[PDB]
Design a protein around this nucleic acid. Structure first.
Lengths: 62, 386, 136, 224
RNA sequence: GCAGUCAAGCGUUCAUAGCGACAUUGCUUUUUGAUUCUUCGAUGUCGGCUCUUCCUAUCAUACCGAAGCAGAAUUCGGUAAGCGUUGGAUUGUUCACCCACUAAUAGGGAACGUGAGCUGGGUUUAGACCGUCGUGAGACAGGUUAGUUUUACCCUACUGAUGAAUGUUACCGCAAUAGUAAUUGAACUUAGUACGAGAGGAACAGUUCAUUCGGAUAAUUGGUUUUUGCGGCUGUCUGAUCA
């Protein structure tokens, strides 16, 4: 059992949960829910989405 | 004319008529075949269905591709307070069926089976089983006469039990009364065991155990009056139809000049008796046993109740059976688990299973955290208390 | 699965019915493919025989070298883009459909297969595993 | 000895087996006659290890290694890695490889001295390969095939290559690798030569349909 | 259209393994004739779609018998409809023909099943075009094009849903009776074994899966989304901000 961290939000993805995505250049992407996935299909930059980990590391939150 | 494209039926003629059940509690039509060797034990049990959760276990199956490798599955957790015995009943085998000759009820019925007998508990004088409970003022010579008549007679012995609904987080307050056949040898020993267990608990660690195949009898989730297409799985018609598309187009031939029973019509869907066999128990969990949801690999203390509780049920604080796969009936229904009727040797059965990880995130959203301690570790401190 | 296949494929989701036009993913010169039927399928009235990752389709070619056009050939799917469920839990899917041209026995027409390849197929057709780059 | 062996119906054993000098890697899904050809002629010389790689049953084409090392991909679980760390000796260097440009079986065609890899794979992988295997990594494509582990079998004595190959590139590889190469086929003329067979210093297992004119040339050029 | 008998011959040799002339006896009522018995104060007329049921004269599958059955494949037959009998190109098509899958793509009935079930492509009203024929009006089972398809609220059937009365009321039950469901294939293994001169080349048990069907469910995954729940955006109006 591995707990893989998300690609968009930084969330933790427990087994049997979420989805995986394979970009055609064979980089593998993992999504917790339909939220981070359906923002990934809008080509949103995760550094400007306020609730991801990448944002809250970008501005030293907490 | 013949059909021109000879295709299967729709639906199943053996599940007819598709009408509403007799009750919300489904009759156990058939009990396991008895052997007069084993110690006295029950054949079935009464739980209340809570809801489902995800399980990660290790599939162990030689000849497969996933041998010794992790899989996920869905389990249903059915909630089980310990079920308390109140009476026994013997059946004499006639040439017209097993006619009940007597029944014997216990001394001090609780207020739940006293509530089963009234449609209106608040107005009633609550006087059920007063004059019957007067039969213990003597040594019980009437009562011992009754049990001696069962021992003299009575080929098969069923035991009246009832759930303890007051321990269940429902809002019903009124227990469900039921019969369960016994399997011990020498019917005198059966009714002696039932006499010894009047007003006594029966916990599921005694009837059921790990790895075992059980059946589940329950009443289907109901869906009202349903048309012929989602009820029977029939084709929709093409879009250009006048006067309704979602129908069965040809009912019958010209002859027989009546509509056959076998064609599909519109009507009730749901709320049927369904028996579903060969479900496998993964956990038998004890409520006094803290950390139901830990396992030998998991090792962090948590119960199986998800964060925020089971959706539309509550919190498991009782024993529970935790069984592979889907089960008939929706949440908060009286679900009757049964021992399997045939000894199954199938290598899907007889597999010693032990879990690895039990899901306990919320079922009320996309749950991201298993325990609130892990949410507090991940998310940090908030605007609230500190 | 079917005649000529090594292994049993666990059932995955069917995301390429009859008529689907997949992107041929090797150096065989065909620029795409076109499913006409599915080896191993089943007979149900007014149902399309659909394919999946790992299956073996009968396909034609609608682009590319004209030596490969107008002839019905075997082909084998290596990417799916309709998400299925692996038994270890995760739902995954690829960015786009794909396939590789092959003979009936499973031997590869081309030499190398571009982009990722689902391991549901690389386990099942060994020759595709030999010519594969990225698996999974 | 070129022993005829099939993996349940397959004339390709190189998909399913990894043959080195100190260890041998086999897939679990075969009968006892599949392991007869291994356990009869090896016997008590090298450990033969039952494993799967990344949840696949093609483990000869997912991994790559030599006498001194073994390289596994990223999707290999910790149970499989722990079993490989337990069953193999302390001389081997086992390490996951952080790249998504292929599986390791079709990139690397290496031996105890000189490695040949895929052209598109990067320097951060090449440093790890040269550190783990202790092998100077070179970058060559055989006759246009970008997959050199599928289309070249390599041993310390000799080596087999793709049948439609220019003589000049073979002489260039003879000057570079310092071993003689002969273009030949395997399994009644199958163009894939790396996956049709494996080889080491003592053994060269092939499929059952590899013909006797192919077999004589193989046992001549690998010098068993 | 299907089936018998007789048996000359064919079948290396041999009437009958499989075929079978010359004849002769039937069954059938999915062809088409023959008749015109009912209906002309009108049973809505082709086909596709749709859905149920029945029939075997069984294509597949279960167990078998014969062979010119060595193995494989095939042929002929028995018990048997239990269960299945497909996706497309062209045509309005029934019919047909190919492409392709499959275990197999068997043939039929039910007012040539089925239009208050649909469609209306065809035929078979009124417009128009052509060829042919006719002096002409017009005629063509000759071709092409555009052409309103009404009603169920009744009784029955069926599907579900209640219900008076049998002292009342409640709870647990029994069972007559009616229905019934599962299905087929592939891979490994047996095993490159048996049988074979060689070429080729199985099966029984076991394992793992899969097709079709069916019954359920909702953890996860996808869809829906008037929680108009949160955010954003436009145009206008609340004097502006806030809402």
């Amino acid at each position: 059992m591995k707990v893989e961290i998300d690609s968009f939000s930084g969330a933790k993805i427990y087994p049997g949960r979420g989805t995986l995505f394979v970009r055609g250049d064979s980089k593998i992407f993992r999504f917790q829910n339909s939220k981070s996935a359906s923002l990934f299909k809008q080509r949103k930059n995760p550094r400007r989405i306020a609730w991801t980990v990448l944002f809250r590391k970008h501005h030293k939150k907490g | 004319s013949h059909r021109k494209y000879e295709a299967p039926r729709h639906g199943h003629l053996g599940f007819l008529p598709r009408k509403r059940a007799a009750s919300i509690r489904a009759r156990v039509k058939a009990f396991p075949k008895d052997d007069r060797s084993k110690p006295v034990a029950l054949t079935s049990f009464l739980g209340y269905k809570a809801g489902m959760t995800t399980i990660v276990r290790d599939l162990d199956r030689p000849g497969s591709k996933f041998h010794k490798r992790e899989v996920v599955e869905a389990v249903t957790v059915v909630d089980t307070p310990p079920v308390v015995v109140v009476g026994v009943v013997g059946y004499v085998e006639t040439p017209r069926g097993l006619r009940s000759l007597t029944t014997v009820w216990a001394e001090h019925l609780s207020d739940e089976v006293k509530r089963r007998f009234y449609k209106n508990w608040y107005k009633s004088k609550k006087k059920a089983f007063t004059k019957y409970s007067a039969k213990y003022a003597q040594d019980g010579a009437g009562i011992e006469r009754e049990l001696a008549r069962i021992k003299k007679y009575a080929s098969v012995v069923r035991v009246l039990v009832h759930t303890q609904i007051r321990k269940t987080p429902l809002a019903q307050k009124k227990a469900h009364l039921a019969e369960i056949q016994l399997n011990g040898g020498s019917i005198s020993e059966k009714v002696d065991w039932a006499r010894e267990h009047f007003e006594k608990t029966v916990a599921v660690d005694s009837v059921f155990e790990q790895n075992e195949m059980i059946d589940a009898i329950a009443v289907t989730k109901g869906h009202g009056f349903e048309g012929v297409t989602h009820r029977w799985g029939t084709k929709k018609l093409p879009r250009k139809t006048h006067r309704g598309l979602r129908k069965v187009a040809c009912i019958g031939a010209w002859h027989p000049a009546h509509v056959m029973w076998s064609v599909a019509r519109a009507g009730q869907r749901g709320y049927h008796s369904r028996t579903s066999i060969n479900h496998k128990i993964y956990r038998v969990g004890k409520g006094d046993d803290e950390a139901n949801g830990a396992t030998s690999f998991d090792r962090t203390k948590k119960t199986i109740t998800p964060m925020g509780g089971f959706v539309h049920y509550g919190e498991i604080k009782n024993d529970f059976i935790m069984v592979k796969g889907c089960i008939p009936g929706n949440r908060k229904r009286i679900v009757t688990l049964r021992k399997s009727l045939y000894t199954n040797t199938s290598r899907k059965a007889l597999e010693e299973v032990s879990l690895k990880w039990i899901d306990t995130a919320s079922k009320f959203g996309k749950g991201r955290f298993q325990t609130p301690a892990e949410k507090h570790a991940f998310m940090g401190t908030l605007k609230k208390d500190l | 699965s079917g005649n000529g296949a090594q292994g049993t494929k666990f059932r995955i989701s069917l995301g390429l019915p009859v008529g689907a036009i997949m992107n041929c993913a090797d150096n065989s010169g065909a620029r795409n493919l076109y499913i006409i039927a599915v080896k191993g399928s089943g007979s149900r009235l007014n149902r399309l025989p659909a394919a999946s990752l790992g299956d073996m389709v009968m396909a034609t070619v609608k682009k590319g070298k004209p030596e490969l056009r107008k002839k019905v050939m075997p082909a084998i799917v290596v990417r799916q883009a309709k998400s299925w469920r692996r038994r270890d839990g995760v739902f995954l899917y690829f960015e786009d459909n794909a396939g590789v041209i092959a003979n009936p026995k499973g031997e590869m027409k081309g030499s190398a297969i571009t982009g990722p390849v689902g391991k549901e197929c690389a386990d099942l057709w060994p020759r595709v595993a030999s010519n594969s780059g990225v698996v999974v | 000895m070129a022993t005829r062996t099939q993996f349940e119906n397959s004339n390709e054993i190189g998909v399913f087996s990894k043959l080195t000098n100190t260890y041998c890697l086999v897939a679990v899904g075969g009968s006892e006659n599949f392991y007869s050809a291994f356990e009869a002629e090896l016997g008590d010389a090298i450990p033969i290890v039952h494993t799967t790689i990344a949840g696949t049953r093609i483990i000869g084409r997912m991994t790559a290694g030599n006498r001194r090392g073994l390289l596994v991909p990223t999707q290999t679980t910790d149970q499989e890695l722990q079993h490989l760390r337990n069953s193999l000796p302390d001389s081997v260097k086992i390490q996951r490889v952080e790249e998504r440009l292929s599986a390791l079986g079709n990139v690397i065609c290496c031996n105890d001295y000189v490695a040949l890899v895929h052209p598109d794979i990067d320097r951060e992988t090449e440093e790890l390969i040269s550190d783990v295997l202790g092998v100077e990594v070179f970058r060559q494509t055989i006759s246009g095939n970008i997959l050199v582990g599928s289309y070249c079998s390599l041993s310390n004595q000799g080596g087999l290559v793709h049948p439609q190959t220019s003589v000049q590139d073979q002489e260039e590889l003879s000057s570079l690798l310092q071993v003689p190469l002969v273009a030949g086929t395997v399994n009644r003329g199958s163009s894939v030569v790396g996956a049709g067979m494996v080889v080491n210093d003592y053994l060269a297992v092939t499929g059952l349909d590899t013909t006797a004119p192919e077999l004589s040339v193989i046992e001549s050029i690998f010098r068993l």
